[PDB]
Amino acid sequence: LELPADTVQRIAAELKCHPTDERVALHLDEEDKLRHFRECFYIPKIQDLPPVDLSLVNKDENAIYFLGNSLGLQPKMVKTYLEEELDKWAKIAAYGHEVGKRPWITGDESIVGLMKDIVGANEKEIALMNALTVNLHLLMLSFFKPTPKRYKILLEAKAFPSDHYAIESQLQLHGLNIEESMRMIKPREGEETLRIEDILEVIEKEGDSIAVILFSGVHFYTGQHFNIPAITKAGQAKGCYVGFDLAHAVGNVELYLHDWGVDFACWCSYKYLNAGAGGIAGAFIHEKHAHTIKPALVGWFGHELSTRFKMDNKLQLIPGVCGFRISNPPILLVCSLHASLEIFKQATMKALRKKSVLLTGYLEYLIKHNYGKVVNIITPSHVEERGCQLTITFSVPNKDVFQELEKRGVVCDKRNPNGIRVAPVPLYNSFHDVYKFTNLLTSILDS
Amino acid sequence: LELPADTVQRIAAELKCHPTDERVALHLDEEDKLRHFRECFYIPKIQDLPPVDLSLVNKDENAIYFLGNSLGLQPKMVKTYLEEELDKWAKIAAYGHEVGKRPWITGDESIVGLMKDIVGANEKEIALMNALTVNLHLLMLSFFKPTPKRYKILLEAKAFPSDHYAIESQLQLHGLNIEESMRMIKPREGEETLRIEDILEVIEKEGDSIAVILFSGVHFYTGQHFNIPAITKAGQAKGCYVGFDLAHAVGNVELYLHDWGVDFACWCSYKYLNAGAGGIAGAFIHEKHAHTIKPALVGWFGHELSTRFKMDNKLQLIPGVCGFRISNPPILLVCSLHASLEIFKQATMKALRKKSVLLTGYLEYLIKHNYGKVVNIITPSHVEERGCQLTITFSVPNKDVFQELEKRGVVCDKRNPNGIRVAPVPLYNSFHDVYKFTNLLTSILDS
Ligand SMILES: *Cc1c(COP(=O)(O)O)cnc(C)c1O
Numbered sequence A, B: 001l002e003l004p005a006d007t008v009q010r011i012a013a014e015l016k017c018h019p020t021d022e023r024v025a026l027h028l029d030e031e032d033k034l035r036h037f038r039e040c041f042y043i044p045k046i047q048d049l050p051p052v053d054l055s056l057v058n059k060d061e062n063a064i065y066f067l068g069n070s071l072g073l074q075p076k077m078v079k080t081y082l083e084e085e086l087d088k089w090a091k092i093a094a095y096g097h098e099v100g101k102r103p104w105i106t107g108d109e110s111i112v113g114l115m116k117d118i119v120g121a122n123e124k125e126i127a128l129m130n131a132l133t134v135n136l137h138l139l140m141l142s143f144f145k146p147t148p149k150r151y152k153i154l155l156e157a158k159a160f161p162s163d164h165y166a167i168e169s170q171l172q173l174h175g176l177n178i179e180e181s182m183r184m185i186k187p188r189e190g191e192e193t194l195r196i197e198d199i200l201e202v203i204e205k206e207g208d209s210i211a212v213i214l215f216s217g218v219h220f221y222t223g224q225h226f227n228i229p230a231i232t233k234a235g236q237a238k239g240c241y242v243g244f245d246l247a248h249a250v251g252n253v254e255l256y257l258h259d260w261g262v263d264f265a266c267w268c269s270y271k272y273l274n275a276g277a278g279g280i281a282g283a284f285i286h287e288k289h290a291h292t293i294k295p296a297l298v299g300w301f302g303h304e305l306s307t308r309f310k311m312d313n314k315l316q317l318i319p320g321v322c323g324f325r326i327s328n329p330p331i332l333l334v335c336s337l338h339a340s341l342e343i344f345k346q347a348t349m350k351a352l353r354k355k356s357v358l359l360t361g362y363l364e365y366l367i368k369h370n371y372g373k374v375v376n377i378i379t380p381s382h383v384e385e386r387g388c389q390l391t392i393t394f395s396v397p398n399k400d401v402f403q404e405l406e407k408r409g410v411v412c413d414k415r416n417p418n419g420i421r422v423a424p425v426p427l428y429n430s431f432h433d434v435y436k437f438t439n440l441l442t443s444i445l446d447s
């Protein structure tokens, strides 16, 4: 299949322009079958952004929002969905637990079907509950059962701090020596990303002593998308459980958790899934574990619905991940996530990933064409080894590139000493966004 | 001080009517300094309630909503508060984490001050996070540390199912025999409530072997309000930790968790606190434990704010209950709770408890006057031994009282075989509500 760089160059030829011409981005936007989804979101205006220098920008232009990997833009329908539940609460109060589009007792289950295609799992394998790191702990309390022979947790070095702290506290819970039991894979000297052959070597050599492998799906800092099925197979080959924090993977890369045989996973909803800060999180457990991996911590919402409200204190635990659901679900959080997932349903992950590959590929192409020496893309170059996000470093001692970018209405993340992350997302970022960004960047780098 | 029954009879004398006259309820409503708060809430109309028989009711009359102990009515300002955060998310997206009335990073801390007077604790002793039973588990993982000598958990028999399941799973986590380690105080033969002298006897006799006492503040089924400071002192006398599930206490009875020296507590926000189904829950840990009782499960939101976002993976744990906060807080849930707590701030728990004593006392008076033989109030009669809620049973073999009540727009809870709970709450229930309810009840009982 045609690589992004080649698509860009072929399109330019057809248009009779240079691949770096604005006309290429405009054409790609015209051909984008997902173009209409941008209208489904509230996009900030440049003049409203706190760090913006108004002298440097055109008023009433949209922001170039490349932070959708961290805090996803708002589906316009969030308010409408909230209003449905507020109106029910106003009109019938307590009766809302049992009636309506989203009966509160089953608020989570009413929309979980919309997650099936996003993570590649069945309805009984997915729970919508709590918060990401909270879910990580709930799962680890059942999946991490260390023995004298098999007691290690394997993860990447420089994991996201929350996961790092979670893993540390899990080890401390069992009185395990951290330095000996917390195995962290570091890159080779002079490299920032991990080589798959190196990960697999560690697993092959140390796997017998490892209880659980807990990796990110996409590493937050490098933008590296790890080979989930390869790590899963390798870990299970050595008798390890393999789970993933998919915070930067869900709604970004395509996922087949069930078919890949992943043991468990967890994710948040306020990044690529656009549900709003601190939104209701998610958990997956493969159905193969439904009768054998039981919740460590139980609440009444792990009791089967049909008899839960008998309140006879005779537990009837739901098999699989829903047995891990402790409390009644927050309807208001269900509302905002639901609005987002209806959009994902219409777009499809297949079509979104297709646009992403071309969009991020176009960004990479323009960067490398303009500065192919000063500018380094740390994110892996193989299209299958990254998602939306590129992590980029700069060697310009006199310029804080990030500061100059944010002053001009580019919303992205800082990488110290002198770099960005940027993640154009297919739902609401355009090829023209990418074109405009690269122009601002070039203008900054030229001084 | 004057008992409710005596207030009712004195008022009637002044009015020159019988204490059972409608004019007494109308007068009490006129004198109610909290009368205006009823306008702050969306009260269902009778015709909108699913089980209502329209032939039996007057259209456009308000429901008699006595289920505010289970799902509290909606503050009208919830929508407005949500809109503030949705507007910020629309306007500045990611920048909302750090700016505004409720910067998302500190969404919980921005409103925690409003809880101080409600639970009687300092800002560093209160966390707003997660869900009730979830918080119970987080606290028990740190407070329940069984030894061969001291391994029991003490609770009431027929505790709320979620707490029952939580306590059971906590015991199983340590491989403890449930029947031997789960000590449940049952009432004497022919009684439904517990005697304080009996609770204290169990504590005195068995206290040395008990690691944690975990009681409800108000028992959901009987409506009994336990003497929290007495149980706390008695338990600590024997070296036990004493914690409470305050789900039916917070926003109902007055609380002084800090001054009483309670070790820990947890509560929900969708009952008397009116925050909406599955709302953000609460946790208390006495400051005396801040440096000695550490979280079992850690996430990045337990790391001090000033260095959290350095993301260097070097934990700097916040002392006390905020060290137990694992994840970033849900802004949308913060919003709805905030709207409610502003109302509580204006009303004050002191004034609300005062109205409650008179209101529930008036309900009890009318019931007992009309049927002082057929009708039994299980809830303790001492004003200090109950909150808003009365639990009532009926001996009428041919009438399902609950069914007849709900058909007429009375919203309450069922008690099998033939009984209610009812909880008139001072924020939005009136003395006239109580009058109307008793009339419907009398009419039902007469047949
Ligand atoms: C309502 C109630 C619960 C409900 O638990 P959630 O965790 O909020 O679902 C738990 N415990 C008690 C004592 C209650 O009254």
Ligand SMILES: *Cc1c(COP(=O)(O)O)cnc(C)c1O
Pocket: A131, A132, A133, A134, A160, A162, A163, A216, A220, A245, A247, A248, A268, B299, B326, B327, B328
């Ligand atoms: C953003 C992120 C988190 C944040 O954790 P919460 O529990 O949602 O506060 C955790 N882990 C990873 C890998 C992330 O990218």
